[PDB]
Amino acid sequence: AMADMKILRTLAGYLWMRDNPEFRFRVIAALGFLVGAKVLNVQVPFLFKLAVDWLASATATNPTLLTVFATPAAVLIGYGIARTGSSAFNELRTAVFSKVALRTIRSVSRKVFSHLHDLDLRYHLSRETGGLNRIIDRGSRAINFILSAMVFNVVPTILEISMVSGILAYKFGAAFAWITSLSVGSYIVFTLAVTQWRTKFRKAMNKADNDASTRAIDSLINYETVKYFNNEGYEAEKYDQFLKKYEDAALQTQRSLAFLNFGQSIIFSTALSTAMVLCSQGIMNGQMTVGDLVMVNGLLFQLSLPLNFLGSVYRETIQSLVDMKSMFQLLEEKSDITNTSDAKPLVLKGGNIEFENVHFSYLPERKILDGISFVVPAGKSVAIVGTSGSGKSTILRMLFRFFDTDSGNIRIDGQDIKEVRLDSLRSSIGVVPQDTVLFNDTIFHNIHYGRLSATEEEVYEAARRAAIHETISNFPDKYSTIVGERGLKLSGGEKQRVALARTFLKSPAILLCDEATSALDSTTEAEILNALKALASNRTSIFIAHRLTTAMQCDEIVVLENGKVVEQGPHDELLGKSGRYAQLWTQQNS
Amino acid sequence: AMADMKILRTLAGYLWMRDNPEFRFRVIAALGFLVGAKVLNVQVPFLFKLAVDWLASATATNPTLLTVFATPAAVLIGYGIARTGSSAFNELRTAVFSKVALRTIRSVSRKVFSHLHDLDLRYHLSRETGGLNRIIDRGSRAINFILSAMVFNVVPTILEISMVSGILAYKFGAAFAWITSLSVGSYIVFTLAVTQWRTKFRKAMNKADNDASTRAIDSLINYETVKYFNNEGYEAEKYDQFLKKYEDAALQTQRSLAFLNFGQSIIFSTALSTAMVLCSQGIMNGQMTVGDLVMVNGLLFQLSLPLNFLGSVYRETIQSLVDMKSMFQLLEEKSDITNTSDAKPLVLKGGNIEFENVHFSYLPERKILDGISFVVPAGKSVAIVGTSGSGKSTILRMLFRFFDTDSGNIRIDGQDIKEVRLDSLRSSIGVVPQDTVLFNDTIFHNIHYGRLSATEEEVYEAARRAAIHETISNFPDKYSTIVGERGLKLSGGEKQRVALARTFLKSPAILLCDEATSALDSTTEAEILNALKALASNRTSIFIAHRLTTAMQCDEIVVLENGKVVEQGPHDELLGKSGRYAQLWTQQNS
Numbered sequence A, B: 001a002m003a004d005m006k007i008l009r010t011l012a013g014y015l016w017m018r019d020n021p022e023f024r025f026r027v028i029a030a031l032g033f034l035v036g037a038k039v040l041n042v043q044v045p046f047l048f049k050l051a052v053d054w055l056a057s058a059t060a061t062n063p064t065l066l067t068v069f070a071t072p073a074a075v076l077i078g079y080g081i082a083r084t085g086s087s088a089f090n091e092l093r094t095a096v097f098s099k100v101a102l103r104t105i106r107s108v109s110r111k112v113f114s115h116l117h118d119l120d121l122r123y124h125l126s127r128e129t130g131g132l133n134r135i136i137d138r139g140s141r142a143i144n145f146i147l148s149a150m151v152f153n154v155v156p157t158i159l160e161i162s163m164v165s166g167i168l169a170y171k172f173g174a175a176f177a178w179i180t181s182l183s184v185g186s187y188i189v190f191t192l193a194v195t196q197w198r199t200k201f202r203k204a205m206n207k208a209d210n211d212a213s214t215r216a217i218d219s220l221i222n223y224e225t226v227k228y229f230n231n232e233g234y235e236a237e238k239y240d241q242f243l244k245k246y247e248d249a250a251l252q253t254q255r256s257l258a259f260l261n262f263g264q265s266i267i268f269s270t271a272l273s274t275a276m277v278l279c280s281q282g283i284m285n286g287q288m289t290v291g292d293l294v295m296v297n298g299l300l301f302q303l304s305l306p307l308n309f310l311g312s313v314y315r316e317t318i319q320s321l322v323d324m325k326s327m328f329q330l331l332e333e334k335s336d337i338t339n340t341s342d343a344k345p346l347v348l349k350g351g352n353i354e355f356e357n358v359h360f361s362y363l364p365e366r367k368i369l370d371g372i373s374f375v376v377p378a379g380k381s382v383a384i385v386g387t388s389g390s391g392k393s394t395i396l397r398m399l400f401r402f403f404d405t406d407s408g409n410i411r412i413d414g415q416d417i418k419e420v421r422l423d424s425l426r427s428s429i430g431v432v433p434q435d436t437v438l439f440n441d442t443i444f445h446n447i448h449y450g451r452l453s454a455t456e457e458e459v460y461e462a463a464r465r466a467a468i469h470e471t472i473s474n475f476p477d478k479y480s481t482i483v484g485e486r487g488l489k490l491s492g493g494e495k496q497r498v499a500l501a502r503t504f505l506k507s508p509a510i511l512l513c514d515e516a517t518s519a520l521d522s523t524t525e526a527e528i529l530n531a532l533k534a535l536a537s538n539r540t541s542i543f544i545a546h547r548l549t550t551a552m553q554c555d556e557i558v559v560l561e562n563g564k565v566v567e568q569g570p571h572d573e574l575l576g577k578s579g580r581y582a583q584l585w586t587q588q589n590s
C-alpha cells in the first residue's frame, strides 16, 4: 500500500545519492554493461549460423561477410571471442553494482541503529532487547539479496526473453513468437504453483528437525537422572521416533522437488522440439536454409539456462520482502516524550529541587507514586528511606525524565522541566547506578567514558582521588587490561569504585546515588563513604540507601511509605517524636 | 589413515545392509538409472547431427536408418523424447537413492547417540553439554551432503567426461582426446587454486560480520548507561567502523568470485573454439567429417554444464569431511569403568554396608576422601554431617559407582562392589537428588518414570501415599498437564514430593537422601519428614542432611571433618562425651 510505496521511494533515495557523481557513473556503467552483455549473447548464435551455412554452401554472397572474415575459421574465432566478451561484460556489471549495493546497505543499517537509540526506554523495557539485533541483521541480508537479485537476474532475463521473442518474430514467421510466449508462460505458472506447494513441505521438515534437536539436548543435559535408573531402555526409542519423523519429511520434500524438475524439463523439451520441427518444415519447403535450425536451437538453449532457478529466487525474494518489511517497520516509531520547540536552556545558579504532588502509575492497575512533595534546599544532602513498595527506585527516573509525570510539576533551580531541552538536564545530572556495567574494553577507556575529550592527567587524578590507582597498579599491565566478560574479573566494590570515578570525572551539579546492597568489610565501607562525602562536598545531593546505617550522614531524612510521605527531618528529632522512622530502626538495628 | 579406512568401511557396511534385499535392489536400480541417463544424454546430440545432415543433403546414400524414422520430423521428435527420457531417469535415480541415504543417516545418528549416552560421568563433566548435540547435528548434515554429492554429481560427471572422450578420439581424429583432456585438466586445477584463495577470503570475511553483530548486541543491551551521558556519540562512530570493515571484506570476496568465473569462462570458450576450428578444417578438407560440427558443439556444451559448480562442491566436500571426522571421533571412546566377564548378579539378604579405608581424589592436587571406614548394620538409619569441605556429596556417587575407588574396599551385604554385575546394584539402589529436574511432559509420565511397565493403580496409590494426590488434584487438569519449562511452575516442596513419590514407586532395597537446602514452613517440613520415615521404615538408609536439626531422627550418627572420621554414635552419647557434635550444636543451634 502507501507504506510499500514509501519504502520503495526511501530505498531509491538511499540508492541514488544525487549529491555525488561517482555512484551515478557506476549505475550508468552497470546498465551499459548489462545491455552490451545481452546483445553479445544474442549475437553469438547468429555467428554460428553464418559459419555453418557458409560451410554447407562451400561443399555466401553478402556485403558484410567475405570482407571482415576471409574464411569460416575467422567466424568461429569470432564466435569464441564474442562468448568471452559477454562473460567479461557480466563480470564488470556485477562487480560495479555490488560495490554500491554494499554502500547503501551500510548507510541504511547505521541510520536504523542510530534512530533506535533515540527512542525512549519504555520501548526497550517492553521486549527482550536481544531480538532487535536479529531483526537488524535479517533486514540487512534481505536488502542485500533483494537488490542483488532484482539487478542481476530478474531484469537481464526479461531483456533476454524480449530480444529472443523480437528476433524470432522478425526474420521468421509469427508462429515462433506464439510458441515462445506460450512456453514461457506455462513454465512460469507451473514453477510458481509447485513452489507454493513445496513451501509447506519444507516448513514441516524444519519444525521436525528442530524438535528432534531439542529433545536430544534435553536428554543429554539430564544425564544423572537417566543413569539413576531405567538405563537407556526408553530414551533411545523416543529419539528414534523423532528421527523417523524427520526422515519422512525429508523424503517427501525430495520427491516433490524431483517431480517439479521433471515437469519443467518436459515443458521446455516439448517447446524446443516443436520449434525445431516447424523450422524443418520451413527448410523442406524451400523458403528457408540450413542453419536457421541451428540458430533456433542455440538461441532457445541460451534462453533456457537463466530460467532454471525460478522457484528458488521466487521463494527467497518473498522471504526477503517480508524481512525488509519488518526491518523498515522498526523505523518510523514515535517517541512518547519529546522536547518543545520553545524550550529554554537550563541555568544552574544553585540547585533547588522542589516536588509538588506528583502522580504516576507504570501500569494503571497499581499506583506507586501518590503526591510526593519533598523540597531539597541548595547545597543540602537529603535521604529517602522506606520499603520495597515505597517506590524509591523511580525518583531518579523522574528527575532524569525517563518517564513523564502524569500530573504535577517539578521546579529544578526554580524552573520547570517540561519546557526545557532534555540535553541540558541530562548534562547537568550525574548518577551512580546500583550495578554498573563495565564495557568489554580497557580500564582507561572505561574511566574516560565519563567525559569524552578529556586529558589523561584528568582521569589519572580522578582515579587517584577515588583511591583506585593503587588497585590499578596491581594489575599485570598499568592502566590497560581487558576487563569484564572474556577478560579480567573486577570486584563489585571495585566496579562501583569505577562508577564513582566516572561520575566524579563528569563533575555535575546534582548527583543521585542508590547504595547497592553488597557484602563489604568495614574498612572499604568507610573508604567509599568518605569518597561519596567528598563527591557531594559542594553539590545538591539526593541519596537512597538500602542500608539505613549509612543514611544518618545526610543533613535531612524523608521517609516514604506506600508511595506517600510520612515524616521528614533529621534522625535525632525523629527519635524525639518517635515517628515511623523510629519503628524502622526497631526492626533494623534492634 | 587407518581411521579413514575404518570410517569408510563402516559407512559402506551401513550403506549395504546385506540382510535385507530391499536396499540392494534400490542401489542396483540407482546405478542402472545413472548409466541409462548418461547414455541417453550423450546420445541426444547424435540424433540432431543425423537430422541436420539429412536435411542438408535433401536440399542418395542410405545408412539404413530410413526404416525407424521415415522423415526428419521423426528424428527431431526423437530429440525431445530422448531429452525427456534422460531427465526422467535422472529424477528416478535421485529419489531412489535419497531413500536409502535418509535411512542410513538416521541409523548412524541413533547409534552414535546411544553410545555417547553410555560413557562415564567424568567425560560428561569435562565437555560442555550442547556442544555434543551441535557436533551430532553438524556431522549428520555432513553425512547427508557427502553421500548425496558423491552419488549424484562426482561419479556421473566422471562417467560423462569419460564417455564424451570415448565418443571422441574415435569416429574423428586423435587430437580431440588431447583437447578434451588438457582443457578439463587446466579447468580443474585453476578452479581448485582460485577456490582455495576465495575460501581464505571468505573465512576472513565472516569474522567481521560476527564482530559487528556482537558489538550491536553489547551496545543495545547496555542502554541505560549510554543514555545517562554521551548518547548517540562514540557508539555510532564505532558501529560505522565495524560496518566499514565488513563492507570491505564483502567487496573483496565478490571481486574474487567474479575473477574466478571469468577465468573459467575464458578457458572453456577457447577450448570450444579450438575444437570447432579444427572440425571446420576437417570438413573443408573433404574428409568423412560432414555436417557434424553441430554434434561437436552440442557435445562439448553438454559437458560444460555439470562443471559449473566445482568450487562450491569442493569446498563443501572438504567441510563435510572434517565434520564427519569429528563425529566419528566422538565414537570409539573408551569408558574408564567396565564390568568384568566373571561378574555375578547381586543377591540381597538384608543390606550391610561396610567401608574399608577408601582413598579418593578427583584431582591429584587435592584429596577429599581419606580412609573412611564406617559400617552400617541391617535395617538401621545412619546420618553423615560435616562442613562443605567434609566431602559428604561423594559417598552416594561411590556407592552408586559413578567413579571408582583409588584404593579401598566396599562390602555390601557381605559382597564386593567391583566384581559383580553393575546392573544389579543400579537396580537395587534408590536415590533422592537435591534438585530433581521435571521433564517437559505430563505429570503422570514423570511420576511413572520411577518404574516402567507399572500399572496405573500402583502409580495412583504411590502418589496418594506420598501426600501429593491432594495437591495434584488442584491443577486445572487432573493427572495431565504441562510441567516444568514451557509450562506451569511447580513448588520446590511439590518438586521434592514428586521425587519422593518417584523413588517410592521404584521401591529399592537401599535408599540415599541429601536433604536439599530450601526455605520451608514447619508443617510441610514435618510432612516430608514423616514421608521420609515411611519410605525408610524397613530399609537400610544413608542420610546426609544440611540442616542438623533433622539428623538425630536417625539411629546412629557419624561426623566427618576434612574427609576423615571423627566420632560416631547417637547424639546423646555425643553430648555425654562432648565431641565435635557438641561444637556443631553450639555454633549451629546456639
Ligand SMILES: N[C@@H](CCC(=O)N[C@@H](CSSC[C@H](NC(=O)CC[C@H](N)C(=O)O)C(=O)NCC(=O)O)C(=O)NCC(=O)O)C(=O)O
Pocket (backbone or CB within 6 Å): A257, A260, A261, A264, A308, A309, A310, A311, A312, B191, B257, B260, B261, B264, B308, B309, B310, B311, B312
Ligand atoms: N560460481 C562458481 C560456482 C559456485 C556457486 O555459484 N555456488 C552457488 C550455490 S547456488 S544452490 C541453490 C539451489 N537452487 C535449486 O536447487 C533450484 C531448484 C529449482 N526448483 C529448479 O527448477 O531446479 C538450492 O538451494 N536448492 C535447494 C533444494 O534443493 O531444495 C552460490 O550461490 N555461490 C555463492 C558464493 O560462492 O558466494 C563457479 O562457477 O565456479
